[PDB]
Each structure stands twice: as C-alpha cells, then as structure tokens.
Amino acid sequence: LFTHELQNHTATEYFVSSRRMFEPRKPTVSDFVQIESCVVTYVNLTRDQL
Amino acid sequence: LFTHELQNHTATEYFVSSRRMFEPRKPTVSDFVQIESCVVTYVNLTRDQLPDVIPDYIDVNKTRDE
Numbered sequence: 674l675f676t677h678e679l680q681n682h683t684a685t686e687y688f689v690s691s692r693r694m695f696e697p698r699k700p701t702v703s704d705f706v707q708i709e710s711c712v713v714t715y716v717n718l719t720r721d722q723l
Numbered sequence: 724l725f726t727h728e729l730q731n732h733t734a735t736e737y738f739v740s741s742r743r744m745f746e747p748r749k750p751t752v753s754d755f756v757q758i759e760s761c762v763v764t765y766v767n768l769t770r771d772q773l774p775d776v777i778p779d780y781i782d783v784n785k786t787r788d789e
C-alpha cells in the first residue's frame with residue numbers, strides 16, 4: 674500500500690499494488706487484518722476519515 | 724469461475740473451482756475485486772440479479788430503505 678504524493682495539495686489518495694507491477698487500484702476490506710498492537714510508524718487516523 | 728451449461732433451460736448457476744480439482748462451490752464476496760474498466764467479454768448484469776448470482780453479496784441501502 675502506497676500514497677501517491679502527499680497532502681501538500683490535498684492528495685492523500687491511497688492505492689495498493691504488487692511489488693513488480695504498477696497497477697494502482699482501490700484497496701478492499703478483505704485484504705487487511707486487525708492487530709491489537711501499534712507502532713510509531715503507523716498513521717493515527719480516526720473513524721470519520723475511515 | 725464457470726457456469727454449468729447455459730440459460731437454455733434456466734440454468735444460469737455459477738460455481739468456482741480450482742483448475743485441477745472439480746469442486747463446484749458457491750463463490751464468496753471476499754474472493755473478488757472491483758475494477759473501473761470493463762471489456763466486451765464481460766456480462767452486463769444488474770443490481771436485481773446480483774443476489775441471484777451471488778447471494779453472499781449484500782446491498783446496504785436496499786436493506787436500510789426497506
């Protein structure tokens with residue numbers, strides 16, 4: 674999962690692709706998992722922005 | 724994903740299986756992905772027939788409104 678550019682001009686769009694092919698596509702819920710532990714590197718988002 | 728026979732006698736049942744094992748089973752929503760582009764070869768279905776091909780699919784507004 675990557676973000677194309679940054680929020681510098683409000684472009685916080687997230688896309689998912691393989692590590693060899695460049696196919697930016699919208700992610701799906703079933704592709705993710707839930708973890709009880711968090712790290713510093715993870716962005717601290719909220720329910721409204723989900 | 725394959726369809727056993729055709730609609731000739733109303734048998735448009737869809738099943739999913741591996742390419743070596745013949746295990747016809749009902750598909751699951753998590754097994755598909757959504758694409759913004761379409762081709763000629765893809766069947767042009769509608770929302771009403773979505774539960775028929777895939778009963779596992781659920782529409783939020785259809786249930787909430789009624």
Ligand SMILES: *[C@@H]1O[C@H](CO)[C@@H](O[C@@H]2O[C@H](CO)[C@@H](O[C@@H]3O[C@H](CO[C@H]4O[C@H](CO)[C@@H](O)[C@H](O)[C@@H]4O)[C@@H](O)[C@H](O[C@H]4O[C@H](CO)[C@@H](O)[C@H](O)[C@@H]4O)[C@@H]3O)[C@H](O)[C@H]2NC(C)=O)[C@H](O)[C@H]1NC(C)=O
Pocket residue numbers: 712713714715716717
């Ligand atoms: C989204 O938001 C979360 C929550 O804030 C961010 O996660 C980090 O959360 C921690 C805890 O709230 C923030 O505080 C940092 O804690 C680090 C580890 O905890 C230690 O805390 C004390 C003090 O360091 C230690 O004695 C104790 O043993 C723990 O090990 C610390 O390493 C950080 O210390 C930094 O600042 C102090 C001054 O306060 C300096 O003295 C240190 O040398 C060091 O520079 C800090 O206390 C932490 O700030 C949060 N991270 C960030 C980046 O803010 C997520 O990171 C955040 N996500 C994003 C994308 O921003």
Ligand SMILES: *[C@@H]1O[C@H](CO)[C@@H](O[C@@H]2O[C@H](CO)[C@@H](O[C@@H]3O[C@H](CO[C@H]4O[C@H](CO)[C@@H](O)[C@H](O)[C@@H]4O)[C@@H](O)[C@H](O[C@H]4O[C@H](CO)[C@@H](O)[C@H](O)[C@@H]4O)[C@@H]3O)[C@H](O)[C@H]2NC(C)=O)[C@H](O)[C@H]1NC(C)=O
Pocket residue numbers: 762763764765766767
């Ligand atoms: C479910 O429904 C969709 C929507 O109809 C079907 O997808 C096809 O959609 C196209 C666009 O609506 C239908 O029209 C065909 O377009 C093809 C490509 O577009 C060209 O259109 C013009 C005219 O050809 C070109 O100048 C332009 O540059 C585009 O490239 C064409 O190849 C088709 O042309 C055929 O008919 C004309 C006469 O109208 C002949 O002159 C041509 O030689 C050629 O034979 C056509 O115009 C297309 O019909 C739709 N496909 C089908 C099969 O109907 C899905 O296919 C459909 N799914 C199923 C399972 O049926």
Ligand SMILES: *[C@@H]1O[C@H](CO)[C@@H](O)[C@H](O)[C@H]1NC(C)=O
Pocket residue numbers: 784785786788
């Ligand atoms: C689908 O949801 C929209 C709300 O975004 C609603 O206006 C519409 O009536 C719904 N349609 C059906 C068929 O449930």
